[model samples]
Target: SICTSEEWQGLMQFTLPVRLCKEIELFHFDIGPFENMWPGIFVYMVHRSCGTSCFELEKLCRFIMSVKKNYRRVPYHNWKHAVTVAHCMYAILQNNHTLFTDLERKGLLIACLCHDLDHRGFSNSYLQKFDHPLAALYSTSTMEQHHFSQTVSILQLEGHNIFSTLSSSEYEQVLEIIRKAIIATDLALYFGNRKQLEEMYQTGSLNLNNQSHRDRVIGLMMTACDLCSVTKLWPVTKLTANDIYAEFWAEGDEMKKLGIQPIPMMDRDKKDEVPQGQLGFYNAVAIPCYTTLTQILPPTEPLLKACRDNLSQWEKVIRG
Candidate 1:
C-alpha cells in the first residue's frame, strides 16, 4: 500500500523475519529456524559472546567435520542432528513460555552445539571393546560418561572458556549450567528427572512452564531432543533408521576388531534380510520413551502414536 520502494524494502526486510519468527514456532523449535541456519550461525553467536582461541575453535569444528558424510547411515545423529538439537533447546525455552537472559541462551546454544562434538558415530557399547583414546582414559568403562564429559574438556581446552568471556566466577556459573545441560542427555540420569515428572503427572505437582525455574525442564528438553528419533519428521525419520544401524554396524566392526561380539542393542547382522536390531530398538526403548513422554504432554500425542503405529508395522517387516 505504501508504494515507495525504499519504504517497502525496509518494511519487507523487517516484516519477513518477524513472519519467519512465527512460522518457526510451528514446524521446528530451536535457533535454526531463525534463518534456516544450522550450526554455523549458532556457533557464530557463541563465538561472538564467548571468544576463544581460533586454533582451538578450528580444532573443535575440524574434529566434527572429520566424521564421514555417511558416518551413521542415519542422518538423525549426524551434524544435522546436532543442529536440530540446538534448535530444539531453543524451542523448549520459547514454547514452554520461559524467559531466558541472553547469557543463558548463549550458554545453551554453546552446550547443544558441542554436545556431540566428536561422537564416534557409535554408542558407548562400541567403545568398551576397543582401545580408542577415550576408551583408555575411561578404562573402557564409563564410556558414555567420558564421552559426555569430553564436551566440557574440549571447551575448557580453549583456556579462555569460550563462553561469556566472564570473570572466573561468572564463567564457572555458565559452565555449570552448560555441563548440566550436556550431561542430562545421557538418559541414564533420567531416574531422578523422570521420577519427579511422573509424580507431577500423578499429582499435578508443579506448573514448571510458568514458574520460570526451568533447570529440570532444560535437562528434559535437551535429553528429549537428543533422543528424539521417535518423533522426527518423515524424511529424517527414515534416515534415522539407517543411522541407527550404521552406528550398530560400526560398533560391531569395532567389536570384531577387538575379538568381541556386539552388545545386545549394538548387534546389526540384518538377520534374514529382516533388519532385526532396528525392530528391537523400536519395540523396546524408543517407543516406550516417546509414548510415556506424550502421555504427559498433549502436544506430543500425535507424534507418539505415529511412532508406535509405524514401529509396529516395521516390526512386521523386520522381526515378524
Candidate 2:
C-alpha cells in the first residue's frame, strides 16, 4: 500500500549488488563502491535497519535520492561520506541493537546520512574567518546548523516524508534526536562533551537509564561514526585522509587567494607535515574518542583497536 504499482516496479529495478550486501554491515567493508551505488545501498540500509514496513517505499527512495542530491560534490563531505557514515552507524547498530530504542536507532541512521548535507568542502573555521553568510546565520557550528536545516527542508518536500508513519510526538522525538546527532558531529562540541563523558565514566556516574546520560552517549556515537575513517584499514584510512587533506588544501588555496596564510595542516606547501598531522589528529582526537566509546560500548572495542592500528601506520610513515 505504501507504493503505487508503477512506483513499486521502479523500486524493484534497483537492487543491491550481492557482494556489497554481504559485507555492508561489516566494519572492514571497503566503501569505495558506495560513491556509485549509494542510492541502492541507502535504500537497502534503511530496509535492513528500520524494516521494510517502517517507511513508505516510494517516499523513502525519493528522500534518499533528495538527500544524496543535496550534498555538494566536496572531496570528503559529499554523498559518499554521508553513506559511509550511515554504514558505520548500521554496523554499530547491528552489533548493539539493544542499546538504543527503535526511534533512537532510526534517528541515528538518518542523522548520519544527512549530517554533512550541503557541505561546500570548507571547514566551519574557514567559513567564519571568510565571513560566509552561513557563519552569519549560526555563530557556532555554522555548517552543521545548515546541514540540519537542509535535512528539514528535504523532509518538507512532497513525497519525501520518510517518517510520515510516526505520530506527532514520535515525529518530534526523532527529529530532535536527528538534530542533536547532526550538531554533535562538529568536533568543537565533541571535545567538551568527550571530557565530560569520560569524567562521568570514571566516576561511575554514567547511567544509561538517565535521559541526559543516554543523550550524551548518542552524541558520542555520532562523533565516532563521523571519524570512523581512522578505524578503517590502512589503505582506506590513508585514502580517506588524503581526500580530507585535498579538501583542506583546496580551502587553503582559497585562503591564499583571499590574502590569508593557511595553517600547516591546510597548507599544500607543508605536505611533508602530513604524517605528523595525522599522528597528532589520531592522538588528540580519534584515539581518545574511540577509547571513551569502547569503555561505554565494549562491542566497539574493535574500532578502537583499528584506530590504534592506523595510528601505528601513521607513526611508521613519520619514522621514515
Candidate 3:
C-alpha cells in the first residue's frame, strides 16, 4: 500500500502543464495519437470548461490518471477503452456544447472517463451467476457501481480530490451527476429511458432545470457515447469487435471453470454467431440508442448513419 501510494506520487510529478490548441475541434481530432495523451486531453478539456487553473489542472490530471490505473488489463475494458469513451464524449460536446449546461458538461465528461473503471472481462450476467461480491453488493449494475465507487475512492485519496476547489453545493452536484451518468452507461438501465427521452424531445417538454428530466438526458448522452464505437469507421468497428469478442471468450473460459455453460455469444465454440451477435446488438441496442438521442441533438444523426453502415457490413458478411 505504501509503495502504491509512493509510486502514485511519483507519477503525479510527471504531470506538468498541458497545452491544447484552442481552435482544434474534437471531431477532426485523431484519438490514434492518444496512447499516452489521455491525461492531457482530459485535463485540457476540463481545465478550460471548468475554469480551473494550470496548477489545478496538473493536480487533476495526476488524480484522474491515478484513477485510470485501477482499470484491469482486460481485452476490451482496459484504460484504452476508458479514454476512447471519454474521447467520444468530448467530440459530442464539441459539436453540441450548448446542449448541456456547464455543470452538466463537466459531470458528463468525468463520468465517461470513469464509466468502465475496473471492469473485469465479464458482464453482469457472469457476476450474478457466480455470486460475485460486487453483484451481492449492488444487486444490479454491479460493474457500474464498482466503477463509481472506485472513482469516489480515488477522489478521497490524498491530493486527488479534483473537486476540492468547488463550493460544497457545487461539489455535491458534480458528484451526484457523475454518479447518475456513470451508472447510466449500463445499457440495461439507460436503454429503458429511451422512450421517455424521445417523448420529451419530440413534445419539446424537456426541462433542464428539473433534475429528473435533466439526469435522463445526461444519462442518454452518456450511453450514446459509451456505444459510440459502433458508429466509428469500419476499421475501428472491426478492431473494437475483435477486442470485445476476445474479452467475451475469456469470460467463457471462466464460466467453463465454474461448470457453467457460456451463452453462444460468449462461447468460442459458437464463433460463427459473431456477425449475428453484432447485428443483434446494432439492431436491438446501438441503433435505437443513437436514433433516440438524435431526436434532440440532430448533429448526432451522423452517428446513427454510421451505425447503419456498420450494420450493412455485418449483414453482408452474414449473407456471404
Candidate 4:
C-alpha cells in the first residue's frame, strides 16, 4: 500500500515533550506556546482517550509521528497546521470531557491528524480544473478521500496497526468513524451539512442521542477544529492568516505554470485583500458554523465568541 522509498523517518531519534497533557487540566491547551509538539500531543491525547497500553502506545507514537512527517512542507497545511487542528479538538474534549462518546473522541483526534495529509497546497477545485488524477480518483470529496485512504495505508503497515488490540467490530467501527470525520472535513461537504444542522437547531430536534444528529455535529466540529486558527488570539490568528495566504499565493505561482490564472485571493498582488478575505471567511463560514455548534454544545459558546471577537479585530484592521 505504500512505497518504501517515501517512508518517514522514525520518531526514535529524540524524547518528545508534551505540554497538552499538563496544560489541558488548566484549560490552557490552546493558549500557550507548545511549538513542535504535535506528535507528542497527538500521542498523549490518543493514549488519554483510547486506553492504548504503554508499550503499544510507544509503537503507535512512532507511527503517528511518521504520519505527521507525511505532511509535505507546504506553507499552511503542513504538519504544524495538522497538530494545531488536533490541538483544537484536544482542547474541546478537555473542556467538555463527557460531550463526545469515547469512539467519537478518538475518531475526532485521528481525523484532525490526517485531514490534510499530503495536501499539495492547492484547493480541490483548482486541481479539478485540469482533471488532476486525484480529482478522478474520487468523484466526490477528492482530497479528503485521498487523506483518509492515506491514513488507512499507514495503519495497514506492520507494527503500525494501533487498533490491533480492539475487537474486530470495534476496529471496524473506529475505521468507519475516522473515515466519516475525515471526509466531513471537506468544506464543500460542510456547506450542505450545515443546512440540515440549521434545520435541526431551529426546529429544536438536535439530539445527542440520535446517531444521525450526532454525526452532523461531529462533522461541524471537524470543520471547527480545522479552522481553529480564526478562533485564536489576535496575534496568533494574524500569523495563521499570513501562512494561509502565503500558501495560496504559492499555489497561484503553480497555476501560472499550468496556464491558469489564480483567483484574487491567490494572487499576491491582491495582498491587501488578506484582511477582507479573512473577514469574509469569518462572516460567511466560521461564525455561522460555530453558532450552530453552540446551540448543540453550549460549552462551545466560547469558540463562537472568540470567532466574533476576531472578526471585529479584522474589521478594525480593514477600517484602519
Top candidate (TM-score): 2
Q: Rate the local accuracy (lDDT) of all candidates.
A: 0.54, 0.87, 0.77, 0.79
What range of 10 consecutive residues in model 1 has the weakest lDDT sum?
1-10
Off by over 4 Å in 2: 1-12
Q: lDDT per residue, candidate 3, 55-127, as tens digits?
A: 3644575577676778887899887887778777877787787767777777777788888987888799888
Q: What is the lDDT of residue 166 in candidate 1?
A: 64
Predicted candidate 4 versus true structure: per-residue lDDT over 212-272, tens digit per residue: 9888988988989888888887888888888999898998888888787888898898898
User: What's the TM-score of each model vs. the native?
Assistant: 0.65, 0.95, 0.89, 0.90
Please list the residue runs of candidate 1 whose C-alpha ends up more than 4 Å from where it truly belongs after superposition.
1-24, 27-37, 40-77, 99-104, 129-136, 139-162, 165-169, 206-216, 271-284, 291-320
Q: Rank the candidates by TM-score, best first.
A: 2, 4, 3, 1
Model 1, residue 303: distance off in Å is 5.1
Ranking by lDDT: 2, 4, 3, 1
User: CA shift at 246, candidate 4, in angstroms?
Assistant: 0.8
| Window of ten residues with lowest summed lDDT in model 4 | 3-12
